[PDB]
UniProtKB/Swiss-Prot annotation:
GO terms for cellular component: host cell cytoplasm. Induction: Expressed late in the viral replication. The gene is E. Changing residue 132 to I: 5-fold decrease in enzymatic activity. The active site is at residues 11, 20. Endolysin with lysozyme activity that degrades host peptidoglycans and participates with the holin and spanin proteins in the sequential events which lead to the programmed host cell lysis releasing the mature viral particles. Once the holin has permeabilized the host cell membrane, the endolysin can reach the periplasm and break down the peptidoglycan layer. Its main location: host cell. It is found in: Host cytoplasm. Keywords: Antimicrobial, Bacteriolytic enzyme, Cytolysis, Glycosidase, Host cell lysis by virus, Host cytoplasm, Hydrolase, Viral release from host cell. This is Endolysin. Changing residue 11 to Q: Complete loss of activity.
Length: 162
C-alpha cells in the first residue's frame, strides 16, 4: 500500500464534477476545483486545469494526471513548510503517508494548526496524539476517514486500510 492507493481509497474517483463533503466543486480524485458556488467557475477552473474544453467531464487518465500533480504538490508543500518539514522528517514511512493524507485533504495551512498533535507526534507519543487529533472539527465532520488516518499515526501500520 502507498500514498496513492491510500488516498485513492479515502477520496474515491469521479469523472464528472461533484460536490464534496463541504459542498465544493471537486472532480477526479479529490481534486478541489473551487470554493465558489458557480458551476461555471468550476467548469472554467476545470478547463483551465485540463487544457481543453471538458464540458465538466474528464477521462480517467486526466483524473490520474491531476492526482499525480496533487500528490506531488502536497509533498512539496510539506517539504517547503517550516512547521511541517521537520515533522515529516521525524516520521517513518507509513506515518509520513498519514501526514501527506492530511495535507492533501486540508492544506498545509489546515494541517499546520494541529500544532499540539504535531508536537505529540514529534515526540512519538502515539496514543496521546491520537486522542488529541480526535478533538477537532476534522474528526467530527469526516469521522470514518479521520479514524483511518489517526489509526495510521497511532500504529505506524496500514491496518486501517486493509
Ligand atoms: Cl492544477
Ligand atoms: Cl469520512
Amino acid at each position: 500500500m502507498n500514498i496513492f492507493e491510500m488516498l485513492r481509497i479515502d477520496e474515491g474517483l469521479r469523472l464528472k464534477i461533484y460536490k464534496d463533503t463541504e459542498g465544493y466543486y471537486t472532480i477526479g480524485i479529490g481534486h478541489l476545483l473551487t470554493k465558489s458556488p458557480s458551476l461555471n467557475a468550476a467548469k472554467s477552473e476545470l478547463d483551465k486545469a485540463i487544457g481543453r474544453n471538458t464540458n465538466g467531464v474528464i477521462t480517467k487518465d486526466e483524473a490520474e494526471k491531476l492526482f499525480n500533480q496533487d500528490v506531488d504538490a502536497a509533498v512539496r508543500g510539506i517539504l517547503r513548510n517550516a512547521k511541517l518539514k521537520p515533522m515529516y522528517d521525524s516520521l517513518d514511512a507509513v506515518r509520513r503517508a498519514a501526514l501527506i493524507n492530511m495535507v492533501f485533504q486540508m492544506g498545509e495551512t489546515g494541517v499546520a494548526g494541529f500544532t499540539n498533535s504535531l508536537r505529540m507526534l514529534q515526540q512519538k507519543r502515539w496514543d496521546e496524539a491520537a486522542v488529541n487529533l480526535a478533538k477537532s472539527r476534522w474528526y467530527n465532520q469526516t469521522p470514518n476517514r479521520a479514524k483511518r488516518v489517526i489509526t495510521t499515526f497511532r500504529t505506524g501500520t496500514w491496518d486501517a486500510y486493509k
